[PDB]
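Subject: mismatched residue count in predicted assembly?

I count 402 residues in my input, but I want to confirm that the predicted structure covers every chain. Input:
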Amino acid sequence: SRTVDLELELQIELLRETKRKYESVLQLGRALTAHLYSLLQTQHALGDAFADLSQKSPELQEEFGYNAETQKLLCKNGETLLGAVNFFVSSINTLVTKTMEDTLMTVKQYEAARLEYDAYRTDLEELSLGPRDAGTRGRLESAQATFQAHRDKYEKLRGDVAIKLKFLEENKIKVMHKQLLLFHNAVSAYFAGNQKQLEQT
Amino acid sequence: SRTVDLELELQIELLRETKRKYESVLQLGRALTAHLYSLLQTQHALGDAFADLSQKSPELQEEFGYNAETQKLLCKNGETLLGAVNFFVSSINTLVTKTMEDTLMTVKQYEAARLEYDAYRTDLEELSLGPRDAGTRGRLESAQATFQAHRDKYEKLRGDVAIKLKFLEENKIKVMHKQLLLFHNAVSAYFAGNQKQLEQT
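Triage response: the counts match. Full output below for your records.
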């Protein structure tokens, strides 16, 4: 037997799974970030190399310079898509690292108080077994205070949670829109802007 | 007083610089390959993640779905791009690592032959530079013998080098033209067959 709040608890469970899912997405984004930056530096180097060869290889100057163009192209077009991912990632991090962490902060608080409320309650039930004498009543009095108090902190915090939860879910949707968008846009904008120059030259 | 084959030696310096530059292109190419493998591995996961956050988050289904897919796409269209980059690298590696390398082995040999040529030539010139006496004639003959063996070995290798350098150059152009082409196509084909399904949805 333990104080349970089926609705809140489920509500709280969801926030935790969401947060975990959102963290592994934040992980994949930073991975994607690290890799793009690597591909970018390698395409700059490759660009310069194909350059140097074109200038030094008349028998093949076209092919080398041709390829040296795309490479340098794809580079400036990558630095962009990159800064965008750097943005998407940085955004979702805040939503997770601070926006969500603050709510989860109140949950751990609520959960701890809940644990204590049940402890002080149980102490009181225990003393109730004792004889109806004077001395036991004195203790049931002390025990009654603490108990009531701890019931207060519990119920308040349980309130501060259902509230914060609602507000948070507001952002989870607002923030994850502007972001899930810009991201996907920057993506198709990268390829688009790139083909527009690859067909030309 | 070293022997010099002006034109041949120029062609040898070119081969050496070319091979060195081509090894750089090769390294960069392996790098590109590595990062591409990494990227794809990260896009497949980010795709599956984005997928789940859609299946389990109706509050955003769309803004998570048209991201999951965009990712799954960039992974088929990007899996083949890899294949081509691998072909490029593996093609150039063979030209560099086997064809140029072998040709260069004949060069190292020729150079070695040239060094010994001068050694014996010198020895011989010096001998015939002293006084003529019983002894300084058996030695002159023994010297002429060794000299000619080495003169022949040197001239032969010098001939092989010139032939080989000419075939290599022809081969270099043939190989670096077909590959430098398929590569620039593959790269552009990625962005092309790209918008075809992306720009379509």
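Helices of chain A lie at 6-56, 61-127, 136-198. Marking this ticket as 'not a bug'.
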